[PDB]
Design a protein around this ligand. Sequence first.
Ligand SMILES: NC(=O)c1ccc[n+]([C@@H]2O[C@H](COP(=O)([O-])OP(=O)(O)OC[C@H]3O[C@@H](n4cnc5c(N)ncnc54)[C@H](O)[C@@H]3O)[C@@H](O)[C@H]2O)c1
Ligand SMILES: NC(=O)c1ccc[n+]([C@@H]2O[C@H](COP(=O)([O-])OP(=O)(O)OC[C@H]3O[C@@H](n4cnc5c(N)ncnc54)[C@H](O)[C@@H]3O)[C@@H](O)[C@H]2O)c1
Ligand SMILES: NC(=O)c1ccc[n+]([C@@H]2O[C@H](COP(=O)([O-])OP(=O)(O)OC[C@H]3O[C@@H](n4cnc5c(N)ncnc54)[C@H](O)[C@@H]3O)[C@@H](O)[C@H]2O)c1
Ligand SMILES: NC(=O)c1ccc[n+]([C@@H]2O[C@H](COP(=O)([O-])OP(=O)(O)OC[C@H]3O[C@@H](n4cnc5c(N)ncnc54)[C@H](O)[C@@H]3O)[C@@H](O)[C@H]2O)c1
Lengths: 276, 276, 279, 272
Amino acid sequence: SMSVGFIGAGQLAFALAKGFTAAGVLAAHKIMASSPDMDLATVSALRKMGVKLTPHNKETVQHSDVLFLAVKPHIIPFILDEIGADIEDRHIVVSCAAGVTISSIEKKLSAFRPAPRVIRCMTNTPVVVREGATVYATGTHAQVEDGRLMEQLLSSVGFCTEVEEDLIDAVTGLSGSGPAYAFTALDALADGGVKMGLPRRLAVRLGAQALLGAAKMLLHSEQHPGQLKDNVSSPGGATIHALHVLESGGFRSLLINAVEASCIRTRELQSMADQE
Amino acid sequence: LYFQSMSVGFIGAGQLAFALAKGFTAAGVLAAHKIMASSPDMDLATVSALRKMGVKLTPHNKETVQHSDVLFLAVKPHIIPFILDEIGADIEDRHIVVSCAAGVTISSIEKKLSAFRPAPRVIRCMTNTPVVVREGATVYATGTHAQVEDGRLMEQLLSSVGFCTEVEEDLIDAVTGLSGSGPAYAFTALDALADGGVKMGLPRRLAVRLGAQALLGAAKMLLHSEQHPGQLKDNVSSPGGATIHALHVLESGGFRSLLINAVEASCIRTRELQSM
Amino acid sequence: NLYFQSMSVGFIGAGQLAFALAKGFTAAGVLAAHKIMASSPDMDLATVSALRKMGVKLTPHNKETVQHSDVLFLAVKPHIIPFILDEIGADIEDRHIVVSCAAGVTISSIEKKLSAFRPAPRVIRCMTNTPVVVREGATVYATGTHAQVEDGRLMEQLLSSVGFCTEVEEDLIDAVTGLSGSGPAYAFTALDALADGGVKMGLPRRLAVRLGAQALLGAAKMLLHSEQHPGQLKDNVSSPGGATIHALHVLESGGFRSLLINAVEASCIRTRELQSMAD
Amino acid sequence: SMSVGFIGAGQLAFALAKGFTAAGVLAAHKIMASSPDMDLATVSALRKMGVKLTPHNKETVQHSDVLFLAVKPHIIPFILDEIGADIEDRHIVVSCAAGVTISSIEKKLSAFRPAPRVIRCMTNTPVVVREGATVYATGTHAQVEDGRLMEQLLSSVGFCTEVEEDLIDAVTGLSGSGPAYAFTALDALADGGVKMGLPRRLAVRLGAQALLGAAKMLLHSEQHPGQLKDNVSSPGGATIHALHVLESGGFRSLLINAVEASCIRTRELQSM
Ligand SMILES: NC(=O)c1ccc[n+]([C@@H]2O[C@H](COP(=O)([O-])OP(=O)(O)OC[C@H]3O[C@@H](n4cnc5c(N)ncnc54)[C@H](O)[C@@H]3O)[C@@H](O)[C@H]2O)c1
Ligand SMILES: NC(=O)c1ccc[n+]([C@@H]2O[C@H](COP(=O)([O-])OP(=O)(O)OC[C@H]3O[C@@H](n4cnc5c(N)ncnc54)[C@H](O)[C@@H]3O)[C@@H](O)[C@H]2O)c1
Ligand SMILES: NC(=O)c1ccc[n+]([C@@H]2O[C@H](COP(=O)([O-])OP(=O)(O)OC[C@H]3O[C@@H](n4cnc5c(N)ncnc54)[C@H](O)[C@@H]3O)[C@@H](O)[C@H]2O)c1
Ligand SMILES: NC(=O)c1ccc[n+]([C@@H]2O[C@H](COP(=O)([O-])OP(=O)(O)OC[C@H]3O[C@@H](n4cnc5c(N)ncnc54)[C@H](O)[C@@H]3O)[C@@H](O)[C@H]2O)c1
């Protein structure tokens, strides 16, 4: 029942706006988004939603109480310089950008007005179906109710928890990049279904249902994923035969490699940002 | 009206019998006491879980057959002919026999039971453990003498606990490799993703939660999207970014091939289980 | 406080397994060594010398072991089983319980040979392992057609004195052979390698061996006394960002898990193939 | 008589607390553990045991005679700053942290009182079943009886020996991380049994028993682990066939790689 803004009108702005309005926590008309190119396909999607669109980032700031920064990490410093003087006492600035530290944001903004209210989050694209995974850290001058408000809002579109900021790059490598790992696994599983004689449409549907179902089981269980895996693996059966071939390929190591590589690239990019 | 006075039985009181019983009762489809399950060893952890559920248990498969309208065969494939010999003379015209056993053909079951009575009503099914959270993936094929309402009853019953669709029987071995074994692939992946989070500094509990939420959310997005998995992948993969870096390391280990390998190995083993 | 005062035990074969079991039983106090007899055609083996020092009766003649024994262990190589059954089949009596320890050899095949001489041989098949020598064996057994219920009970009592023991269906025994029968060799290989790792990083070999073996022993005991999944116990060792999780990743990268699955499979398959050639 | 404290109330504090009380060396109520998060599973487990719990590390220090530092390496200098002024002459400070040097600990504590008694330790979680593998090195001001007391205490929960401090990073890689390698191996061995037709519960029991028995054999034998392997490996048989497939995957190299990777990471944990 408050005004929300997005600097950037891309994949994430759309996913979050769609999630929030689907959840009934925000009205489309109370959301404004800005982008230099008002022609992107995400901008058309946001427009069909009933979100207000403008090329001017200063309008989005003036409209908003909660302001999401939804631009690529290297654009963050530029927009902070652009609208730093327009930030007001009322604003909660929520950065969604991978890698970008609360300290870097607070430093740019504090030049214009002291005590900016800053929250850093990492979320993912499934907020669009209200099954996101979101973490946030509160800044130096965030009020206690600011983190509570943020958890309330982001909980409407998935799992939300507060973390120490020093965990966010790792979360980025796991749940931020995680959907892409799943989409790749699902395409491959469907290819396997197809190789064994299934129609593609049926293979995609069953693969995706299998992954959704397994994930829900784990979330609702008190047991270790190893135990749930044990329960599927009948002695001498089809499943244990398949698990062996995954093991022989170092399947588990690949997913460990993936989380590590995404985390390291996130950290590495911010080092370049900090040096620059 | 299908579930109004239906009695269900399970030959086998193991992981699948428990999973389906928990799902059916959670769904509100059947009262727990309207379900019976039988096993030689009544001291398994699965028999104990079923007992606390309120499900009637007995060591005698004949008693399960007499109680049941719909009779689920939930034993290892090599035990199916043994129990068909045992209780085949007790299978009346009224029974719908639902084989959940990997690989075991409708033909083989009908050949056995037809020696006792001429028109045994036989359905073959492949399902998975996530029926326990009503997010299963189920296929069924109807036998020679299954009536039109038998398939509708089966679709209604198995749709209460997740996805369900009728298929040609010749797809079922493939489905086994994809969605039957699928949850085990997911559990392995989630354990490995959590290990990745942990290597990069996340507490285990948070890493498990975030990984599972990421998979669940991505699966949901795919099911609700009109777009190809590769396109959804592209929406997460920012140029030069963390995610595309992680995807490369997955590609470098042949991640996709491993999942194809798994679906294939499970399907091939299911085919061997029937020959043997 | 167990002791079989009326039980005479014999081993046909005086090798690694006969020594391991005799040593375990006598350490357990359930049998006096002079109530044990073992036979082998080679009476100049280290295992024969070790049995002699221990107080076990030795003879070259298998018929003497049979005549001494109530419980008769067949502790010869699988391919030697048919020969010794032909040799002593006519000497089997009502009182004998024949306990085959041979890898792969079916109750069926043993019962078929002995039944030619005298019907209703009481036969039990077991799979054990060398750690019975320190009373920490892993033993399974299956009862034959003519085995009394008191026969299985007695054998479990005896074999439980030297480690874990449980009854199984005979069709699981080749797989047990691949896991717990061959298992100690997998462990000895792992301990040698872990010690080499300790030495590479600067430890004296003796300390490296002690610490590695203690780590494995302790971990195994933890799992046995825990209600938690081995994955959960692993998780508790693995501090975020820490040493352990880094080492686990390099294990995963080499397909460590697959290798152990490969080993159990290969040992089980070889066990089945050898019998298939025998039969 | 002895009061024991843990700064940190996580996996290690729980394991050691469980071991010591199971050994009958300490009454649970003579142990106090502290943690800023009192809503952890480990804290609840310690609470059920009868261990005293507090969010205040100073309370743990004042309670304790032997004070175990059971926090992550990077937290160590923070808590040394915090409670350094509360360290008394009676205290033996026992650091269990991976990689953290006696030198670094004495440097911090020596700013407050001149002769802090510091012991560095590496142990492992099987202390919970009194079969831990523990090593320790004594600091500059640790008396001979401090080392003896520590050996008596840690020997009640498993193997314990004194080493030179320069060996501890390598021990961390072997016995510190070792139980996790064993749990991985046991899970995989059980998967193998299940593949070949065994029930999971039986496969887990048998695999664990096989490992326990084999380890015990080696500890009670004067023979090389290669010779013990030979005694299981009949010519042409099942075991030698399985050993070949292990060799073909470079099984031994993987375990060497693991010990090295843990030791090297332990050395990095300190350097930064
Ligand atoms: N897509 C994901 O999976 C995901 C998930 C979590 C977090 N994020 C984070 O969200 C941020 C944006 O990601 P995305 O995928 O939506 O980016 P993307 O390119 O879709 O969208 C970026 C938007 O920023 C706009 N933009 C460029 N310059 C601008 C400026 N000066 N002022 C205002 N807008 C400008 C672009 O026109 C575009 O509309 C990144 O920092 C990323 O780390 C992305
Ligand atoms: N677990 C899964 O993920 C899953 C999913 C779909 C289908 N299935 C199929 O279900 C079947 C059962 O698998 P599970 O995982 O439940 O096996 P699991 O080992 O529980 O065993 C099932 C039950 O069969 C019982 N049984 C053995 N002999 C019997 C007899 N003579 N009479 C009655 N009961 C007997 C066992 O005692 C046990 O209670 C298999 O054919 C499998 O392919 C399993
Ligand atoms: N060693 C293990 O790890 C182990 C574990 C479990 C089961 N087993 C089984 O135990 C059996 C023996 O194994 P082992 O390791 O003790 O063998 P090994 O060679 O040490 O001993 C074999 C013994 O049989 C004797 N022998 C040969 N021909 C004979 C004959 N005609 N009559 C009597 N004795 C004869 C040999 O002289 C020797 O004393 C095998 O079937 C093996 O599968 C071995
Ligand atoms: N887990 C093992 O297998 C093992 C074995 C030997 C040594 N260690 C060492 O023990 C140390 C702790 O490992 P763990 O696995 O028990 O850690 P883990 O996180 O379970 O527990 C650490 C504990 O420290 C607490 N803590 C954090 N900050 C604190 C502070 N400022 N004051 C007091 N307590 C604080 C945490 O809340 C938690 O209770 C590490 O240095 C590790 O190298 C672990």
